Ligand binder design. Structure first.
Ligand SMILES: CC(C)c1ccccc1[C@@H]1CCCN1C1CC2(CCN(c3ccc(C(=O)NS(=O)(=O)c4ccc(NC[C@H]5CC[C@](C)(O)CC5)c([N+](=O)[O-])c4)c(Oc4cnc5[nH]ccc5c4)c3)CC2)C1
Length: 137
């Protein structure tokens, strides 16, 4: 599995579901799990998107501080889904705040963090295939 195209296809979906235009069960599983998670934490996500205050030279710091605080006490599948949902929120806010080019950079950050800081736990927990067996259709 290529973590890059997982990020690209998820980000493309999250932006297309908002009106912006930017091997498959994993993408559908991440889609369903992320949509349910964003619905369950709608108030927390509304407060998060309101207090983001995205600027070109603060987006990476806000992204990092939330990601490391999310994975500070370990990794699980739910925190990975929240990681994906958080990236989608940051891409939507980037498009929302006259900063569409930021989407590309965000996609490179997610890919990098997946390839360098989550690939070990994922492989040591059955990989993305185990993610689809547990919470996928
Ligand atoms: C806005 C905010 C919320 C936020 C977002 C992003 C980053 C930071 C934040 C904020 C900023 C500061 C604080 N911070 C929040 C604090 C925080 C709260 C949340 N918290 C966590 C951490 C772990 C779990 C936890 O249960 N994990 S699990 O057991 O591995 C796991 C269990 C079930 C599933 N799927 C079941 C499936 C779903 C699809 C269906 C319906 O079709 C079929 C059934 C998955 N799964 O991967 O799909 C993994 C959790 O609960 C759920 C409950 N159900 C979920 N369903 C999808 C994800 C998911 C997560 C919340 C992590 C810590 C994040």
């Amino acid at each position: 599995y290529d973590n890059r195209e997982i990020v690209m296809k998820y980000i493309h979906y999250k932006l297309s579901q908002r009106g912006y235009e930017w091997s498959e069960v994993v993408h559908l599983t991440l889609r369903q799990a992320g949509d349910y998670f964003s619905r369950r934490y709608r108030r927390d996500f509304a407060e998060m998107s309101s207090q983001l205050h995205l600027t070109p030279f603060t987006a990476r710091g806000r992204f990092a501080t939330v990601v490391e605080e999310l994975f500070r006490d370990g990794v699980n599948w739910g925190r990975i889904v929240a990681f994906f949902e958080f990236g989608g929120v940051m891409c939507v806010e980037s498009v929302n705040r006259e900063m569409s080019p930021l989407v590309d950079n965000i996609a490179l950050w997610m890919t990098e963090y997946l390839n360098r800081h989550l690939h070990t736990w994922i492989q040591d927990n059955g990989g993305w295939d185990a993610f689809v067996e547990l919470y996928g259709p």
